């Protein structure tokens with residue numbers, strides 16, 4: 001691939017992300033003063049564990065649906081075989097969400113945009129997974145220190161998804177070629193914008209993998225306590241990705 005092709009890939013990736021970003025960045029910023037009162041925080045802490053898990057699983061499922069659309073609009077993704085499309089989304093969708101979440105994180109007060117207002121870590125105490133929540137808040141805090149532009153988030157999350165090392169890929173070489181083109185696009189954009197210094201500050205890949213593992217572990221603990229809640233009230237796309245059909249139809253329906 002030549003230079004003009006790399007720059008066209010940069011614009012293509014940034015456009016696909018803008019169309020699928022779900023929450024507009026300026027909308028997230030304009031709401032930073034809108035914070036839950038102590039009474040509203042107490043209301044969240046008084047909710048039952050299973051109610052809070054269901055609500056968070058619903059919110060996560062909705063965000064994942066936008067990551068699926070990002071993948072479908074991503075250059076070269078729909079060219080891969082269906083097995084590899086599903087392998088990449090199963091391993092990478094949650095990792096993309098984890099990176100995207102930093103846009104709704106306010107590092108000044110350590111609050112996140114959740115259900116219409118900003119609140120701190122204590123909002124989620126009823127989940128009974130404080131270590132996982134604290135890890136996600138720290139991860140978003142680390143990403144916030146990099147001051148990602150929207151274009152940088154686009155290119156970085158494309159690479160999080162297009163990972164040729166995922167186990168189960170049938171056409172590993174094809175994914176390797178697409179990953180390399182995306183890496184050139186990412187690094188070309190950082191060089192042109194004088195932002196190559198962020199490369200050494202990006203999180204290790206085992207970090208994203210560690211957070212997803214924690215998520216699956218806490219889910220299996222909750223599912224053991226409330227199996228009927230998961231069966232009856234968790235989104236089916238959520239169960240397909242994280243518990244132990246939907247992705248196929250999302251990819252086919254376009």
Ligand SMILES: C[C@H](CCO)N(C)C(=O)CCCN1c2ccccc2N(Cc2ccc(C(O)(C(F)(F)F)C(F)(F)F)cc2)S1(=O)=O
Pocket residue numbers: 021022023053056057059060063097098099100101102103104105112113114124127129132133136137140215218
């Ligand atoms: C990615 C998407 C659009 C891109 O801009 N976006 C901004 C959002 O969806 C908003 C999420 C904002 N939140 C956030 C951002 C930073 C750090 C923490 C948090 N939240 C706490 C939280 C809740 C729930 C969970 C869980 O659901 C999971 F699965 F994600 F870990 C769990 F509790 F079940 F574990 C894990 C942390 S949060 O309130 O969900």
Ligand code: NA
Pocket residue numbers: 102103104105106107143144
């Ligand atoms: Na941020």
